[PDB]
């Protein structure tokens, strides 16, 4: 069957958090306005996409665009595939603002709510917007990729949305985004350092600068979970385990270009192979968070909390060993065409 995007294969579960716990967040408003909002960079001090692109109001514009394209010839298709996937993930931004606005105690109820929570969501969104913009124009000018197939993938992606399975729970929500932000920090950070190798400093600065925005986001979301562990170590420990069993699905897992039915798997494979984001990175993030939130040092947990706590502390090495042995899928990986690069083929 033709033009059918992939769908979420799990049953939709809404409003799992007990409705009384909504007050905890109303209470933490002030706290958020002092421990969280402080991780937003004020607009006037933020970089903008133009800072890293050829200046179209400068006599230098032509040579700049020309050097950009020359450099891009020395960057192999493999890398463009990954980079394209990252950029597409970024452009599906409106979905992610919705992701935060689904959380019970934290949603923006009007579109301009004076709450600390709604203020964060809006400013976080505003920061994220520059990531897509910048990688978009870069890919556009490069000439190495097929902007029409990329634009088409993006429209499929927004139509599809995503269900991270947070069930409207600020607990699950902020656990989720804590994990994703770090993942984003690793991918972008990796494309950055790798971007230097292939011979493009400017592209490295681009990726690096996006990475730095991610760290700050991670820091912000991790202070919230930390705080939730402090206030409710039982609910939070339980929320943490729940997310992991479910597995953290990536925001663009429903990726579809109208040709490949396994586009996300394929994109990911290349990212894995290239060492941009690996099955191992997923583990390191998990382990980091376990240590960062002091899950192990938690005491006075219900028989429920204890099973959860133990599960979470012993999942990283289990995931490690298992999705370690890249025997039958790393070496014998077939070559595959991607419509994002005009059906040129790269090694999966």
Which of 77, 86, 91, 214 touches a copy of itself (CB under 8 A)? 91
CB 245 within 8 A of CB 323: no
Residue 148 near a copy of itself by CB under 8 A: yes
Question: 217 touches which of Fe ion, a copy of itself, none (CB within 5 to 8 A by kind)?
Answer: Fe ion
Which of 101, 169, 178, 187 touches a copy of itself (CB under 8 A)? 101
Phi-psi bin for 162: left (phi > 0), alpha (psi -120 to 50), beta?
beta
Q: H/E/C letters for each residue in the chain?
A: CCCCCCCCCCCCCCCCCCHHHHHHHHHCHHHHHHHCHHHCCCHHHCCCHHHHCCCCCCCCHHHHHHHHHHHHHCCCHHHHHHHHHHHHHHHCHHHHHHHHCCCCCCCCCCCCCCCHHHHHHHHHHHHHHHHHHHHHHHHHHHCCCCHHHHHHHHHHHHHHCCCCCCCCCHHHHHHHHHHHHHHHHHHHHHHHHHHHHCCCHHHHHHHHHHHHHHHHHHHHHHHHHHHHHHHCHHHHHHHHHHHHHHCCCCCCCCCCCCCCCCHHHHHHHHHHHHCCCCHHHHHHHHHHHHHHCCCCCCCCCCHHHHHHHHHHHCHHHHHHHHCCCCCCCCCCCCEEECHHHCCCEEEC
Q: Provide the minimum distance between the beta carbon of 131 and Fe ion in the complex, in angstroms, as a whole number.
A: 4
Q: Provide the minimum distance between the beta carbon of 81 and Fe ion in the complex, in angstroms, as a whole number.
A: 18
Stretch that binds a copy of itself, among 153-161, 202-210, 294-302, 304-312 (CB under 8 A): 153-161
Which residues have CB under 8 Å from 56's CB, separation 6+? none
How much is the CA Rg of the chain, to the nearest whole Å? 21
Site for a copy of itself in 50-89 (CB under 8 A): 50-51, 53, 56-57, 61, 65, 69
Question: 214 touches which of a copy of itself, Fe ion, none (CB within 5 to 8 A by kind)?
Answer: Fe ion
Residue 24 has phi, psi (to 5 degrees) of -50, -45
Which residues have CB under 8 Å from 329's CB, separation 6+? 269
Structure tokens at 203: 């592209």
Whichever of 138 and 240 has its CB closer to a copy of itself, that residue is: 138
Whichever of 44 and 332 has its CB closer to a copy of itself, that residue is: 44
Tokens 């978009």 locate to 136
Question: 65 touches which of a copy of itself, Fe ion, none (CB within 5 to 8 A by kind)?
Answer: a copy of itself
Tell whether residue 128 is among the known ligand binding residues.
yes
| Binding region for Fe ion (CB under 5 A) | 128, 131, 181, 214, 217
Tell whether residue 70 is among the known ligand binding residues.
no
Tell whether residue 131 is among the known ligand binding residues.
yes
Whichever of 182 and 273 has its CB closer to Fe ion, that residue is: 182
Stretch that binds a copy of itself, among 104-112, 191-199, 235-243, 320-328 (CB under 8 A): 104-112
Question: 264 touches which of a copy of itself, Fe ion, none (CB within 5 to 8 A by kind)?
Answer: none
Residue 36 near a copy of itself by CB under 8 A: no
Residue 158 near a copy of itself by CB under 8 A: yes
Tell whether residue 74 is among the known ligand binding residues.
no
Residue 38 near a copy of itself by CB under 8 A: no
Structure tokens at 18: 């007990």
Whichever of 134 and 341 has its CB closer to Fe ion, that residue is: 134
Residue 99 near a copy of itself by CB under 8 A: yes
Whichever of 131 and 227 has its CB closer to Fe ion, that residue is: 131
Which of 156, 267, 282, 293 touches a copy of itself (CB under 8 A)? 156
Stretch that binds a copy of itself, among 25-33, 96-104, 228-236, 297-305 (CB under 8 A): 96-104
Tell whether residue 127 is among the known ligand binding residues.
no
Residue 97 near a copy of itself by CB under 8 A: yes
Q: Provide the minimum distance between the beta carbon of 133 and Fe ion in the complex, in angstroms, as a whole number.
A: 11
Residue 326 near a copy of itself by CB under 8 A: no
The annotation places the binding site at 90, 128, 131, 181, 214, 217
């Amino acid at each position: 069957k033709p033009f059918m995007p992939p769908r979420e294969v799990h049953v939709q579960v809404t409003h799992s958090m007990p409705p009384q716990k909504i007050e905890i967040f109303k209470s933490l408003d002030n706290w958020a306005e002092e421990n969280i909002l402080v991780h937003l960079k004020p607009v006037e001090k933020c970089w903008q996409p133009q800072d890293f692109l050829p200046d179209p109001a400068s006599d230098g514009f032509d040579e700049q665009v020309r050097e950009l394209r020359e450099r891009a010839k020395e960057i192999p298709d493999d890398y463009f595939v990954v980079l394209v996937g990252d950029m597409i993930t970024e452009e599906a931004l409106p979905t992610y603002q919705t992701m935060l606005n689904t959380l019970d105690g934290v949603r923006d109820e009007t579109g301009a709510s004076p709450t600390s929570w709604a203020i964060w969501t809006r400013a976080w969104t505003a920061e994220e917007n520059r990531h897509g913009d910048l990688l978009n124009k870069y890919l556009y000018l490069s000439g190495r990729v097929d902007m029409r197939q990329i634009e088409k993938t993006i429209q499929y992606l927004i139509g599809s949305g995503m269900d991270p399975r947070t069930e409207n729970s600020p607990y699950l929500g902020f656990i989720y985004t804590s994990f994703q932000e770090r993942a984003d920090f690793i991918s972008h950070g990796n494309t950055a350092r790798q971007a230097k190798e292939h011979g493009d400093i400017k592209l490295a600065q681009i990726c690096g600068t996006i990475a730095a925005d991610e760290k700050r986001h991670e820091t912000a979301y991790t202070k919230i979970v930390e705080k939730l562990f402090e206030i409710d170590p039982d609910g939070t420990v339980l929320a943490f385990a729940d997310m992991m069993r479910k597995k953290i699905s990536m925001p663009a897992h429903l990726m579809y270009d109208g040709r490949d039915d396994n586009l996300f798997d394929h994109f990911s494979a290349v990212a894995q192979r290239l060492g941009v984001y690996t099955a191992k990175d997923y583990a390191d993030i998990l382990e980091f968070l376990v240590g960062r939130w002091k899950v192990d040092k938690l005491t006075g947990l219900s028989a429920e909390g204890q099973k959860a706590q133990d599960y979470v502390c012993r999942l990283p090495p289990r995931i490690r060993r298992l999705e370690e042995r890249a025997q039958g899928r790393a070496k014998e990986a077939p070559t595959m065409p991607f419509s994002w690069i005009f059906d040129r083929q790269v090694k999966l």
